[PDB]
């Protein structure tokens, strides 16, 4: 299949993504959680109890029971709104983390797919390489036998051709383990993929590097979590302050309460007193408390907080610095990669033509074998580092997006129309 | 010594398995915490106190004291028992991990011994790559005395030979922090160790990939982390769960209470009402609660703790893609290594007949000298090529054994006895 | 500016350091969090409460309204005291951390500072690689026209002149990234810094290794902090022990009840019991708690401290595996440094005579243009090469007072004195 294909595939299946949406969704939930203690808590707690006098009530007995439905609610606690205000940041942060981490599913996906390629492009080239091999062989081996080429002509070019075998053996290896790569990325096996069709294929200069600055600069997921994050310890400043404020709350019951005595000293004390009670209370109720004095712990606490806030903000001075050498790295090599496409291009142009003369150059004396060889050896070299140089260029066309922050799907899209031609991941 | 006996000595001081196995052992102790309040708490507290009345009790003071006898009991409280069924899950899954961080002891220990091996292996080719050069640069000149050598010949020759003396000393060094790196892992020095017996040596082929992959889906380690992992977020999902049920606890005391009156309007009240109690108290008693309404602090715990097991889930998919991509790249790696021992073998025979040819060359006039160095440099490097090839293919056994997740003390028994000559870690 | 100037600018801005700096601040006002128990606290409630009775109580009901001040004081709690010993150690563990950081801005400035050098001088023998093989070109070009070489001689030598051209390029690419990596650390850019002042350059030999060793176990900070470290587990160990003991608190309150009744049943009860009550109480009391037996909680608690404790030991016996293998690589490794920069400045000399005689024998049919460009190519990598050495010692010097723990910034103003010429980074 084409890039689209294949990463859409495992979009759907990738447990490095879908673990990422997993802590996203707790996350989200949890601030569920953090309402709570601002809504109605309603509980029943029913008490038996027997108890046995002695001393100054030795033949007091009592069998008690209780019961009631309690109710506690939050009137004014700025400590539980405040959790739940942290929560919703919390939550919003791990959803730049999610969107960070869908952006690395494109980036990867897109460079295990190309690192295929590569190794298909490796492979088939030093198969080409194998093969032209041969046939110098056999024709140094069929005027060896008439007598006008030296045995160490012959035994340096079988030496020379037992490595292109060597080469070709762990050329594959590479090749598989580079699906294997793909298929813990992807949960597939792709019998063929697509390459980079290679006629029609030009570089794109990049935006100038400030632009891209400036829009990273706004958009960049990293940076933006930096910010979330210092904002979360903002917050967490005014939460060591809650300690300093009051808290009122209400409570209501409905309780009934069941004593009964025996023993001895309740038989005729006559005071009904020691007679069957049978209670029930509707009460409503305030609890007022304010904090006045705590061992200086409420200041301790902000103090920290603070500290914590002035780390949250080197920590995002850290976050700019890593973003522009970011952006700039990734301008500096995208260029750097255009200019090694272009010489690159000319070098195999060069050795093209370079072999082509010392072929013709050996078949009648001119240059010897181990001159045919190097040239070609040189060719198949450009050759790779060529269609491998372009891959890079790809790959930092990504980078540059990611950078930015904006890399997504439509980025992948394009990329898919410059691949057509469906290339075998198992040659034979 | 041998590759045992290094292993085993390292066994009793690798202060990163030491760790490991305190990390297991607090963690199956801390059973035992987890359990403790599913028993009997017992207390004892006292409390004496002062009281002073003033307004309506303007003249009523007491001086009390109480002491008492407490213990309480969990009769049914179901979120106690699961602490007990987590922490013991925990120590289990602590177990996994102490179980492959032994084998990573084993491959760990195993590395560096051949990387010694190795650093060895090349010094002493790059011994014999000098003292070959030396030999050879002393018939050039003494050849050049003698008027039919080039002057360019010998200044390319020493230039050539002074590098081998600048590798020779950057092999050294190699060689020397290898050592370095054994001793680290393994608490020695040692002045030999034992190579590679390279005559009795050949490959054994392995297992066919999808076997091994079967293999590894029962036992790979880290596989049956992930899957106790699952086991735990699920437990977890009950444990969230848990907090709908009721709890019913015992408690029971022996109390004693010592009051006495004082002040003034305590100076004939006489009805014997601020006269001295001392009271006692035998008790018992049943607390049952039962949660009703919590703010859907409940029910947001729950759905929490699912996505947690979504994740923990995810995280297990994770493993198994890790698993076979290990496994597969870990055959494949071995089938590379196999071919590839076969092709140095060979190149080795090559690079040696290709030299043996242009001595007898250079010697009468019909190839130079730098035909004769790039003849011997070439060989060397098979040499070494080879030797360290062998090496990879050892290792990559054991990698195999290690994603089978059956990596153990006989797999380095078996290997022991492949090599046999003591060999010195500090060559003069 | 030189690499003080530049380290010094990057000492009042680094936000990796900063952040260190402000886990330091936080750690250590967080003992004054811990003190806080040990301190007294002092609350304020006021709790109005409506009961409404029903059954036995049919007809009473009662409006109350209470206020007390309140004061706790621990008078004897071991516990608190070993939370305010923990803080303290943890505070001393962050600091040795801080001090560990301070470093790694030493040596990351240093090493980021030479890095840009070295990328310079790559650069600058590049383009005199370049320009030589130009002038080697023209002259092979105005004898390849008066007949007298081979035109594969010209298109070998085109073919590898548009290497050096390509080679140039990803060589200022190097650069640019270099000075990238100096911003990110320093906060900068900098036009022109100072390279290592050539001849005024000596190697200083190493102190004894055995020295380095026993000065490295007194001061590494990797080290100390294993130390620290042990040193928490076993307060942790007391920790765990406090449970068994008692503790003793103070309290003392100022309250103020004020009761009044309603209903039916209070209407002519004449008993004076549902008349207004109006308390008043100071009070001041000691509760003394001791535990018995908590379900062996607290032995297991300690067992844990202690298994932690020989898990802290490990650890410790890690770190001077670690300082052994750091302090003894790295002497080694500036020992084979100096034998490098000795070998490289020798292979230069060899490389730049050899030179010479093959350009007197191209331009006097000797030797060919590709033997001219081989010596040339191979002088100008010696030439890196030894360069390259030479900040590798540099860089070598400051590794060994890192694993030393003594690096600091005396260490980079002797390193400063050895530099002195201005040399742009951004060569046109
Ligand atoms: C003589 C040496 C003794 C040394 C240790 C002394 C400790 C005190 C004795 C405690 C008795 C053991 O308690 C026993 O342990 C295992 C582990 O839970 C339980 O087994 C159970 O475990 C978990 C709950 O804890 C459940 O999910 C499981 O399905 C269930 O089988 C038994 O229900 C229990 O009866
Ligand atoms: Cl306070
Ligand atoms: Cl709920
Ligand atoms: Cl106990």
Redesign the interface.
Known sequence: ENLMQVYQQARLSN??L??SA??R??AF??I??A????????????????????????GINSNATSAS?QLTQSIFDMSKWRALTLQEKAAGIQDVTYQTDQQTLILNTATAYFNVLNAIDVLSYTQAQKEAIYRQLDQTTQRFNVGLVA??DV??A??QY??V??NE??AR?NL??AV??L??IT?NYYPELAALNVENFKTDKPQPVNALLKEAEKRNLSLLQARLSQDLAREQIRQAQDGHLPTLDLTASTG?SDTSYSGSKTRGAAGTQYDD?????????????????????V???V??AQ??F??AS?????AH??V??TV??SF??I??SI??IN??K??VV??Q??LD??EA?FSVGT?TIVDVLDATTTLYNAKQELANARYNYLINQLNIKSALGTLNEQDLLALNNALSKPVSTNPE
């Open positions: 447990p490095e879908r673990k997993a802590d969704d707790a939930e949890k569920n959680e309402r709570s203690p601002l809504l109605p808590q309603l509980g029943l707690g029913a008490d038996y109890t027997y108890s046995n006098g002695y001393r100054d009530a030795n439905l045995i160490t035994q340096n079988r030496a037992d490595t075998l060597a053996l762990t290896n598989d383990n294997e790569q298929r813990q949960g009934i009670s049978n209670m029930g209370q509707n009460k409503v109720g305030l609890s007022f408390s304010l904090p006045i004095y705590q061992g200086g712990m200041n301790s606490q103090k920290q500290y914590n002035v780390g080197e920590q995002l001075e850290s610095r890593s522009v050498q700039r790295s500096n090599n260029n750097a200019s090694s010489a690159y000319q070098a060069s050795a033509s370079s003369a010392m150059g240059s």
